[PDB]
């Protein structure tokens, strides 16, 4: 019926092997710090990890992170993926150094590494994704539009099995990076520390005086006088009463937010994968910093 995607550990690799891929991505983050005006590639790696995981359809088990399908042209040239090709190019040299890691395993660890090296919470991660054939590549159109409202978001997230708490926890990833006109028809960052992982997104959403305006791509965005932005989907988080009390909780307690995000991000990343009972437990990688590097 629904595909079954069983996780299979890369033959003969253990924890230490994966700690090494992580340490390489980390060292590389540290080093190419000039990208996107000095934001670094942190934010674009997190976004690449969400986008390869977000094509998942809980109905027939297609899409999701398992197959590393982003490596194929169809997925790669998905208009909603515009701009991701920068996270790809960044990880290529790494893949060439550790050729035994599957794609989906690399693309997902990149997201975890970014968060943790950007001072986020530790995200437990699992190995085992296996590259599948070019024909298992999901058609374009499964990632969410940004010009919509809270019911649109609730609905969309439901296909990925995420509830309210998970959607608001994931969304605060919007503290990182920024929109770029050329990629999405949106322009501007969400906050000021856009390369440190904090609950900043929620404080802005609650504390700024936002104005609705149209941008040069002729799309509407919410503009703050501090120079921040909020897409319609972000904005929708304070329109809905269920979402807004959760926003508040997070504006109010960065810990809580970190715990909730950790859990939701892992789930997002393991959606669609069956892990045998004998599969190793999830790894918690040390940062560069905890390793003294
Ligand atoms: C309805 C849900 C979402 C919508 C409509 C949305 C839309 C967008 C758009 C339009 C951009 C800007 C692209 C560009 O021009 O570079 C963006 C960037 C980004 N997204 Fe979201 N996104 C959503 C959810 C997520 C989630 C769940 C995450 C991770 C949990 C995420 C992480 C990011 C990051 C980190 C960036 C910044 C990337 C950079 O600086 O290149 N977003 N998102």
Give me the phi and psi of 210, to 5 degrees please.
-95, 140
Residues 115 and 220 occupy one common structural domain: no
Strand order in the sheet with 229-230: 210-214, 220-224, 229-230
Residue 217 and residue 185: Cα distance in Å, rounded?
5
The count of other CB atoms within 10 Å of the CB of residue 210 is 19
The preferred substitution site among 113, 157, 177, 185 for testing ligand 1, maximizing ligand atoms within 8 Å of CB, is 177
Q: Which of 48, 268, 68, 75 is nearest to 176 (CA)?
A: 48
- The rounded Cα 220 to chain-centroid distance in angstroms is 23
115 lines ligand 1 (CB under 6 A): no
CATH number at residue 244: 1.10.420.10
CATH number at residue 60: 1.10.520.10
Q: Beta strand 178-179 with 210-214: parallel, antiparallel or unpaired? A: unpaired
Burial environment of residue 255 by CB neighbours within 10 A (0 to 12, 13 to 18, 19 or more): exposed
Are residues 238 and 207 in contact, defined by beta-carbon separation less than 8 angstroms? no
Residue 60 and residue 248: Cα distance in Å, rounded?
35
What is the chain's alpha carbon radius of gyration, rounded to the nearest angstrom?
18
Three-point CA angle 243, 248, 251, nearest 5°: 125
The count of other CB atoms within 10 Å of the CB of residue 20 is 14
Residues 74 and 36 occupy one common structural domain: yes
Structure tokens given for 44: 């674009």
Residues 70 and 195 occupy one common structural domain: no
Residues 251 and 282 occupy one common structural domain: no
Are residues 202 and 251 in contact, defined by beta-carbon separation less than 8 angstroms? yes
123 lines ligand 1 (CB under 6 A): no
Three-point CA angle 152, 154, 155, nearest 5°: 65
Residue 38 and residue 181: Cα distance in Å, rounded?
18
Structure tokens given for 190: 């969400």
| Count: domains in the chain | 2
Resolution of the entry in angstroms: 2.2
- For 182, the 3-state DSSP assignment is helix
Residues 90 and 205 occupy one common structural domain: no
Residue 223 and residue 231: Cα distance in Å, rounded?
9
Residues 139 and 281 occupy one common structural domain: yes
Are residues 172 and 282 in contact, defined by beta-carbon separation less than 8 angstroms? no
Structure tokens given for 234: 């972000």
Residues 203 and 229 occupy one common structural domain: yes
41 lines ligand 1 (CB under 6 A): no
170 lines ligand 1 (CB under 6 A): yes
The distance in angstroms from the start CA to the end CA of the chain is 48
Distances (CA, A) of 21 to 96, 145, 217: 11, 33, 39
- For 1, the 3-state DSSP assignment is coil
- For 47, the 3-state DSSP assignment is helix
The count of other CB atoms within 10 Å of the CB of residue 71 is 18
Q: By what method was this entry solved?
A: X-ray
Residues 103 and 169 occupy one common structural domain: no
173 lines ligand 1 (CB under 6 A): yes
Residues 67 and 201 occupy one common structural domain: no
Residues 250 and 271 occupy one common structural domain: no
The preferred substitution site among 179, 181, 193, 235 for testing ligand 1, maximizing ligand atoms within 8 Å of CB, is 179
State in Å: Cα 276 to ligand 1 middle: 32
Are residues 223 and 188 in contact, defined by beta-carbon separation less than 8 angstroms? yes
User: Which residues lie below 8 Å from residue 210, measured CB to CB, with a gap of 6+?
Assistant: 222, 223, 224, 230, 235
- For 181, the 3-state DSSP assignment is helix
Q: Beta strand 229-230 with 220-224: parallel, antiparallel or unpaired? A: antiparallel
- Active site amino acids: 51, 190
* 174 annotated as belonging to a binding site for a ligand: yes
Report which ligand 1 atom has the smallest distance to the Cα of 187. Answer: 15
Question: Which letter does DSSP use for residue 179 in this model?
Answer: E
Residues 90 and 61 occupy one common structural domain: yes
Residues 70 and 129 occupy one common structural domain: yes
Owning domain of residue 110: 3-143+265-293
């Amino acid at each position: 019926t629904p595909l079954v995607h069983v996780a299979s550990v890369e033959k003969g690799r253990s924890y230490e092997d994966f700690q090494k891929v992580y340490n390489a991505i980390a060292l590389k983050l540290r080093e190419d710090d000039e990208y996107d005006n000095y934001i670094g590639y942190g934010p674009v790696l997190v976004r690449l990890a969400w986008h390869i995981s977000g094509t998942w359809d809980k109905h027939d088990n297609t899409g999701g992170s398992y197959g590393g399908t982003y490596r194929f042209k169809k997925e790669f040239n998905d208009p909603s993926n515009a701009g991701l090709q920068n996270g790809f190019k960044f990880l290529e040299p790494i893949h060439k150094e550790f050729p035994w890691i599957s794609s989906g395993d690399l693309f997902s660890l990149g997201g975890v590494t970014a968060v943790q090296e950007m001072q986020g919470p530790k995200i437990p991660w699992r190995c085992g994704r296996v590259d599948t054939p070019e024909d298992t590549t999901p058609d374009n159109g499964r990632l969410p539009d940004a010009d919509k409202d809270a019911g649109y978001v609730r609905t969309f997230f439901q296909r990925l099995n995420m509830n309210d708490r998970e959607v608001v926890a994931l969304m605060g990833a919007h503290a990182l990076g920024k929109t770029h006109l050329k990629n999405s028809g949106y322009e501007g960052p969400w906050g000021a520390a856009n390369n440190v992982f904090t609950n900043e997104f929620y404080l802005n959403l609650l504390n700024e005086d936002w104005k609705l305006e149209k941008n040069d791509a002729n799309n509407e965005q919410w503009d703050s006088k501090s120079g921040y932005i909020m897409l319609p989907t972000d904005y929708s988080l304070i329109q809905d009463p269920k979402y807004l009390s959760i926003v508040k909780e997070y504006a109010n307690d960065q810990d809580k937010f970190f715990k909730d995000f950790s859990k939701a991000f892992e789930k997002l990343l393991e959606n669609g994968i069956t892990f045998p009972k004998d599969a190793p437990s999830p790894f918690i990688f040390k940062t560069l910093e905890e390793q003294g590097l």
